[PDB]
Amino acid sequence: YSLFPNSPKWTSKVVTYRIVSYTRDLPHITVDRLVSKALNMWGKEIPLHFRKVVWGTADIMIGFARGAHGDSYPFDGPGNTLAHAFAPGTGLGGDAHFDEDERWTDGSSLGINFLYAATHELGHSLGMGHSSDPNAVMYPTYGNGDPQNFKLSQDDIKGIQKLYGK
Ligand SMILES: CC(C)C[C@H](CC(=O)NO)C(=O)N[C@H]1Cc2cn(c3ccccc23)CCCCCCNC1=O
Ligand SMILES: [Ca+2]
Ligand SMILES: [Ca+2]
Ligand SMILES: [Zn+2]
Ligand SMILES: [Zn+2]
User: Fold this and answer.
1) Which residues pair with 128 in a beta bridge?
2) Cβ of 142 less than 6 Å from ligand 1
């Protein structure tokens, strides 16, 4: 595993998150449930708790967007980069954006599995860097394992716990 330079991490006991925009590909409630699942996958391993807010600023702002969308990291259309996120910090720090040009799915159809992508992106929101282990969720490419049957690997758990304790 790897962490960001200077090991940025949240210092608060609770981290807030807000889903600012949704994808037309999935019901809103599915995205809400999948984001909660992704966050608790990492949450189960560490001393951290999350709270969803529906207005204003939240630590972790989540949204879908296509092409250029403010942050100077424009999406590229279908394929290639699927989503991206930023290390803990203020503003853009900790946020996670998903490329709306991708066909998102909960796993019951063809497309990119939103739960797998969200677990990877929120790992960055929490301070995780990319891993060299093809089995880790933090590996940089999508599709090595099974997007519909996965769990954090020992490499991922080792990293998050090094960052926040057990
Ligand atoms: C892990 C995922 C949730 C988020 C990551 C990016 C990321 O790590 N965000 O935090 C991602 O999108 N990885 C690309 C990496 C990638 C693979 N190729 C690329 C060609 C061009 C640009 C990028 C890529 C080869 C062709 C296949 C393109 C379609 C699949 N794309 C990927 O696997
Ligand atoms: Ca894309
Ligand atoms: Ca933020
Ligand atoms: Zn962005
Ligand atoms: Zn990544």
Assistant:
1) 3
2) yes
Domain that holds residue 31: 1-166
Question: Strands of 49-52's sheet, edge to edge?
Answer: 49-52, 14-19, 60-65, 96-99, 83-85
Between CA 23 and CA 11 the distance in angstroms is: 31
Q: Which 8-state DSSP code applies to residue 36?
A: H
Select from 139, 80, 88, 90 the least CA-distant residue to 112.
80
Q: How many domains does the chain have?
A: 1
CATH number at residue 77: 3.40.390.10
Per DSSP, the three-state class of 41 is helix
Query: What's the rounded Cα separation, in Å, for the pair 95 and 145?
Result: 26
Is 111's C-beta closer than 6 angstroms to any atom of ligand 1? no
- Tell me the technique behind this structure: X-ray
The residue annotated as part of the active site, out of 25, 100, 121, 156, is 121
* 121 counts as catalytic: yes
Resolution (A): 1.9
Query: If you take atom 7 of ligand 1, which residue's CA is the nearest one?
Result: 84
**Cα gap 64→133, rounded to integer Å:** 28
